[PDB]
UniProtKB/Swiss-Prot annotation, chain A:
Belongs to the eukaryotic ribosomal protein eL14 family. InterPro entries: KOW (IPR005824), Rib_uL2_dom2 (IPR014722), Ribosomal_eL14 (IPR039660), Ribosomal_eL14_dom (IPR002784), Translation_prot_SH3-like_sf (IPR008991). PANTHER family: 60S RIBOSOMAL PROTEIN L14, LARGE RIBOSOMAL SUBUNIT PROTEIN EL14. Keywords: Acetylation, Cytoplasm, Ribonucleoprotein, Ribosomal protein. Component of the large ribosomal subunit (LSU). Mature yeast ribosomes consist of a small (40S) and a large (60S) subunit. The 40S small subunit contains 1 molecule of ribosomal RNA (18S rRNA) and 33 different proteins (encoded by 57 genes). The large 60S subunit contains 3 rRNA molecules (25S, 5.8S and 5S rRNA) and 46 different proteins (encoded by 81 genes). Pfam families: KOW, Ribosomal_L14e. This is Large ribosomal subunit protein eL14A. One of its GO terms (molecular function) is structural constituent of ribosome.
From Swiss-Prot, chain B:
PANTHER family: 60S RIBOSOMAL PROTEIN L35A (PTHR10902). Belongs to the eukaryotic ribosomal protein eL33 family. GO terms for biological process: cytoplasmic translation; ribosomal large subunit assembly; ribosomal large subunit biogenesis; rRNA processing. This is Large ribosomal subunit protein eL33A. One of its GO terms (molecular function) is structural constituent of ribosome. There is a cross-link at K46 (Glycyl lysine isopeptide (Lys-Gly) (interchain with G-Cter in ubiquitin)). Pfam families: Ribosomal_L35Ae. Component of the ribosome, a large ribonucleoprotein complex responsible for the synthesis of proteins in the cell. The small ribosomal subunit (SSU) binds messenger RNAs (mRNAs) and translates the encoded message by selecting cognate aminoacyl-transfer RNA (tRNA) molecules. The large subunit (LSU) contains the ribosomal catalytic site termed the peptidyl transferase center (PTC), which catalyzes the formation of peptide bonds, thereby polymerizing the amino acids delivered by tRNAs into a polypeptide chain. There are 2 genes for eL33 in yeast. It comes from Saccharomyces cerevisiae (strain ATCC 204508 / S288c) (Baker's yeast).
UniProtKB/Swiss-Prot annotation, chain D:
This is Large ribosomal subunit protein uL6A. Its main location: cytoplasm. Gene3D superfamilies: Ribosomal protein L6, alpha-beta domain (3.90.930.12). PROSITE patterns: RIBOSOMAL_L6_2 (PS00700). GO terms for biological process: cytoplasmic translation. Component of the large ribosomal subunit (LSU). Mature yeast ribosomes consist of a small (40S) and a large (60S) subunit. The 40S small subunit contains 1 molecule of ribosomal RNA (18S rRNA) and 33 different proteins (encoded by 57 genes). The large 60S subunit contains 3 rRNA molecules (25S, 5.8S and 5S rRNA) and 46 different proteins (encoded by 81 genes). uL6 lines the binding pocket for eukaryotic elongation factor 2 (eEF2). SUPFAM superfamilies: Ribosomal protein L6. It comes from the Eukaryota. It comes from Saccharomyces cerevisiae (strain ATCC 204508 / S288c) (Baker's yeast). GO terms for molecular function: rRNA binding; structural constituent of ribosome. Component of the ribosome, a large ribonucleoprotein complex responsible for the synthesis of proteins in the cell. The small ribosomal subunit (SSU) binds messenger RNAs (mRNAs) and translates the encoded message by selecting cognate aminoacyl-transfer RNA (tRNA) molecules. The large subunit (LSU) contains the ribosomal catalytic site termed the peptidyl transferase center (PTC), which catalyzes the formation of peptide bonds, thereby polymerizing the amino acids delivered by tRNAs into a polypeptide chain.
UniProtKB/Swiss-Prot annotation, chain E:
This is Large ribosomal subunit protein uL13A. GO terms for biological process: cytoplasmic translation; maturation of LSU-rRNA; negative regulation of translation. It is found in: Cytoplasm. Belongs to the universal ribosomal protein uL13 family. The gene is RPL16A. GO terms for cellular component: cytosol; cytosolic large ribosomal subunit; nucleolus; ribosome. It holds the Pfam family Ribosomal_L13. Present with 43300 molecules/cell in log phase SD medium. It comes from Saccharomyces cerevisiae (strain ATCC 204508 / S288c). InterPro entries: Ribosomal_uL13 (IPR005822), Ribosomal_uL13_CS (IPR023563), Ribosomal_uL13_euk/arc (IPR005755), Ribosomal_uL13_sf (IPR036899).
Length: 136, 106, 172, 190, 197
RNA sequence: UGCUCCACACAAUAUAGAUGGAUACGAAUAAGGCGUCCUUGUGGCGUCGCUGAACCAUAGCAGGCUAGCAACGGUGCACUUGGCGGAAAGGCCUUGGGUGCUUGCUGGCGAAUUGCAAUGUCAUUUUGCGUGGGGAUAAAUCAUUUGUAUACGACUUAGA
RNA sequence: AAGCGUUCAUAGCGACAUUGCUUUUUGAUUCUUCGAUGUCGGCUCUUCCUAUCAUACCGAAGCAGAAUUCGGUAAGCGUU
């Protein structure tokens, strides 16, 4: 009775789109797209995280599902207030993707003693979990 | 436990070579788990062993060893140049070597 | 040519007793460094005035930077170049943020679409289009439509390993 | 040239439900069900308001935005085929020998048996593809009608019928004898 | 980092998978390739079929039994692309090629073993969309491989046996991931959350 | 006193190269996976990816002797119940009891002198010889013979 | 493509010019062989090329039929 068409949503290259820089002097920081230059290049700015206003290839950029209201061509001061007003950092930090980023950084910084504590604790956690499966 | 490895696994790749002439004095080693020259700078100077067996017993052991050390980085992918006390016998291309953690600055 | 740099090269003829204080001719040059800059200057003064490097002088070499290196602007560039069988003028358009980077894109464009090397190209004029609708190319005009928005289908993720265990997808 | 985005629109009548897979298009109407596989273009179908479907190409060249308008008309024709139908009218032209066309049967296949084409003793046999219906009409002499839900099915079966009557080893500007297509239309356009 | 690495041939480009496998064997890694009939080649089918016909016509003139052999099976077409990337006439290349097994379909014991892919050889990651490609099943059959329909009947048989393996594994993954989820918000769980695990 | 199998005993023999674990859907990639729900769909909603940097495993004289506590689990060893797997099955899933071990938690005893490092030896292949526990009890070739064969070999037949 | 082809450049041709290909002609060269590579033709036998005479399937004509002519794929199979 109803036309059921798979929408197939995507991340859109646009002003106000939020990017996670992978390669460069930033390499893990957040920035906002300020102006699309061409199909492969944009104008980004990450003033709260410290990314300078630069033209960057989209191939050293990973668009995120975060957007916020932003006029095209907005300067750093304008971008800074709307970044803080829209709570871009908080919305990013609560997502599972950013949590996994912090988890891999937390794991890399473990000492030898801390890793040993992880082992003893993971055996304590698995003792209750495995007897949970047996009785259920 | 069941793991006792105090070294890092490694493969003997080849000798240092041009297109047509090789240099047996220098071996090329792939360290399991490095892919960047700046990661290979960690292992510079570390003692490499190649461990192999023989039927004839030498000094109470049927196991022999050749000792080398990492001397510098090779290429862009974590391959390291290594010089052994006696050059590796070129049949060990693809064989496992043990890259140790000593001498240690870490 | 890590980047092109724009220089002003001001030069003059060598002063003589009969005609001291010559006319102080100046050009804008796109070059990788100040050596090529001074070289290209004399190459163009040959095309106009009766002077060469021996009978001339370089009075000033000043690098010119963008007044606003971080605002995207529409650039119109006129290029006279040499084909394999003749000389041709053409006018192209590049969307970018600086004159030096548009020239970098332009030299890539000539060498890619016309096989014209840096050797064969004469940058006639690099002019930013001041207001919209004086942009005459559809490959730049398509980037000036209001509320522009496009996706990037078929994302290819460069793995750091030779073997992967997941059959990776291309979503984005 | 690489256009940023090129766009086509597919109107949907009220009785038609269009369900899009990855790219398998299904159009279900009054006259049956037509499905098509479109895995070979890399387009994005999106629905607007249940009577207007949109198909898009992002970052496409000349040869590929051309393929955007072909998939528009393929979906259009399947939709038109389940509402108005597709009906082809063919005539029989022959100079001397009458052309004898009759629907015969061999193991449930229902061939178009053509006889006496230019005095040939050879029997011509054109199968009917599943989903086509063929009737010989009346009030017009020596005319055959091919009907079905999909234009692809019916036009190919008309082409199969026309091509089998090709005159060999003769000047075909004089020996014009053969079954030809006269009118391509819809089953219900009144 | 596995004692035997098993690559699923499906979706891969034949030459780029052959470049990786050649260098993998030469470094001492044992490699097993399965489902070689779903390998892919860039270019349309007819173009690649012509390239095989040019290869078929070259043979020793005075004795065809000693000339270049023209192997039909897609596993041996892939193996033919591995040779030429390996110094096969040397004893080191002979020892390398001993570290290779290539198969049509997925035979035992590899049916119940983990399969990997090579993202630099995957066609969906490598080829520009819209560019045509050839499948090694159709090419091999079109030049005389006799076992496409046999492998298909056994491959679909394995998929049925494997889909219902994944059916009960989904049920067991559900039960395990439930007790682990309940184990959260506990004392031990919140300590491992600070230590990253 | 020949052969074969099973077990453990000593020697040799080698090693294309163990040093925690080859950790199993299928398809698509202009799409999917997981979970949940409903009217069971080419369905709705949520969630995930953006790499395996994972997951499992992992502490003890290369991992010893012993005391409890909690719990009825985890894992190993043979034995075992039933089913499935012929593409190269030769493996997978089970069932029941027995015997260990447990680092899930709390204790006690031992380790040293390999002297400041020396692979500091822990594997699986092949072969002999031995010991004790089962099992079986042939052919082929030459020579003779045939001519469906044949230069010779070969082939094809017959002979207690 | 100036003309021929009843008219009509290009069905089939095609002047004046001009661009090539081939190595089955003959020239031109003298690099190899003069302590020798047996020399013309024919017979015999195999294979290859395609610039296709025939045979298969076609396209075109100044193709009504017939017989032809031009052209395509094609050397599979023949050519006394
Ligand atoms: Mg080498
Ligand atoms: Mg070298
Ligand atoms: Mg015909
Ligand atoms: Mg005729
Ligand atoms: Mg040779
Ligand atoms: Mg030809």
């Amino acid at each position: 009775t109803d036309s059921i068409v798979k929408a197939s949503n995507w991340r859109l290259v646009e002003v106000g789109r939020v990017v996670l820089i992978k390669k460069g002097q930033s390499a893990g920081k957040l920035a906002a797209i300020v102006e699309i230059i061409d199909q492969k290049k944009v104008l980004i700015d990450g003033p709260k995280a410290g990314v300078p206003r630069q033209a960057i290839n989209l191939g050293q950029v990973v668009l995120t599902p975060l957007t916020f209201a932003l006029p095209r061509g907005a300067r750093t001061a304008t971008v800074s207030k709307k970044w803080a007003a829209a709570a871009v950092c908080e919305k990013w930090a609560a997502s599972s993707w950013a949590k996994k980023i912090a988890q891999r950084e937390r794991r890399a910084a473990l000492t030898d003693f801390e890793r040993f504590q992880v082992m003893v604790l993971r055996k304590q956690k698995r003792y209750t979990v495995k007897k949970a499966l047996a009785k259920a | 436990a069941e793991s006792h490895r105090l070294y890092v696994k490694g493969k003997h790749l080849s000798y240092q070579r041009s297109k047509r002439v090789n240099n047996p004095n220098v071996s090329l080693i792939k360290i399991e788990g490095v892919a960047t020259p700046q990661d290979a700078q960690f292992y510079l100077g570390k003692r490499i062993a190649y461990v192999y067996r023989a039927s004839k017993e030498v000094r109470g052991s049927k196991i022999r060893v050749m000792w080398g050390k990492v001397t510098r980085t090779h290429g862009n992918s974590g391959v390291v140049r290594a010089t052994f006390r006696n050059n590796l016998p070129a049949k060990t291309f693809g064989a496992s070597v043990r890259i140790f953690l000593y001498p240690s600055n870490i | 040519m890590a980047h092109f740099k724009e220089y002003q090269v001001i030069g003059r003829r060598l002063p003589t007793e009969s005609v001291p204080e010559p006319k102080l001719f100046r050009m804008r040059i796109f070059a990788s460094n100040e050596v090529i800059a001074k070289s290209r200057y004399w190459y163009f003064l040959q095309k106009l005035h009766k002077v060469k490097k021996a009978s001339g002088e370089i009075v000033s070499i000043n690098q010119i930077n963008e007044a606003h290196p971080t605002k995207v602007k529409n650039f119109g560039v006129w290029v006279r170049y040499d084909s394999r069988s003749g000389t041709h003028n053409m006018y192209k358009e590049i969307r970018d943020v600086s004159r030096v980077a548009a020239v970098e894109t332009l030299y890539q464009d000539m060498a890619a679409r016309h096989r014209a090397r840096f050797r064969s190209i004469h940058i006639l004029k690099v002019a930013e289009i001041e207001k919209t609708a004086d942009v005459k190319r559809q490959y730049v005009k398509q980037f000036l439509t209001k509320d522009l928005k496009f996706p990037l289908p078929h994302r290819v993720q460069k793995s750091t390993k030779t073997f992967s265990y997941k059959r990776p997808s291309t979503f984005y | 040239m690489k256009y940023i985005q090129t766009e086509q629109q597919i109107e949907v009548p009220e009785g038609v439900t269009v369900s899009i897979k990855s790219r398998i298009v299904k159009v279900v109407g009054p006259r049956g069900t037509l499905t098509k596989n479109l895995k070979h273009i890399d387009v994005t179908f999106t629905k607007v308001n249940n009577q207007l479907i949109k198909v898009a190409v992002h970052n496409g060249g000349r040869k590929h935005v051309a393929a955007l308008r072909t998939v528009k008309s393929l979906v259009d024709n399947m939709i038109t085929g389940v509402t108005k139908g597709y009906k082809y009218k063919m005539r029989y032209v022959y100079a001397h020998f009458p052309i004898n066309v009759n629907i015969v049967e061999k193991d449930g296949a229902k061939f178009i048996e053509v006889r006496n084409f230019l005095g040939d003793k050879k029997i011509r046999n054109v199968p009917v593809r599943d989903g086509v219906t063929i009737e010989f009409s009346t009030n017009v002499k020596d005319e055959i009608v091919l009907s079905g839900n999909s234009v692809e099915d019916v036009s190919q079966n008309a082409a199969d019928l026309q091509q089998i009557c090709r005159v060999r080893n003769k000047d075909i500007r004089k020996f014009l004898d053969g079954i030809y297509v006269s009118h391509k239309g819809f089953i219900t356009e009144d | 980092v596995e004692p035997v690495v098993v690559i699923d041939g499906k979706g891969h480009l034949v030459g780029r998978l052959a470049s990786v496998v050649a260098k993998q064997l030469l470094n001492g890694q044992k490699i097993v390739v399965v489902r070689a009939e779903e390998l892919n080649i860039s270019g349309e089918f007819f173009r690649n079929k012509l390239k095989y016909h040019d290869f078929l016509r070259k043979a020793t003139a005075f004795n065809k039994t000693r000339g270049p052999f023209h192997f039909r099976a897609p596993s041996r077409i892939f193996y033919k692309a591995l040779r030429g990337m390996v110094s096969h006439k040397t004893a080191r290349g002979k020892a390398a090629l001993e570290r290779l097994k290539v198969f049509e379909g997925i035979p035992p014991p590899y049916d119940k073993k983990k399969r990997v892919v090579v993202p630099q050889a995957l066609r969906v990651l490598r080829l520009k969309p819209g560019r045509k490609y050839t499948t090694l099943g159709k090419l091999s059959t079109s030049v005389g491989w006799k076992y496409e329909d046999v492998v298909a009947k056994l491959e679909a048989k394995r998929k049925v046996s494997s889909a219902e393996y994944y059916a009960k594994k989904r049920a067991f993954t559900k039960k395990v991931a439930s007790a682990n989820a309940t184990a959260a918000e506990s004392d031990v769980a919140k300590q491992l959350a600070a230590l990253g695990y």
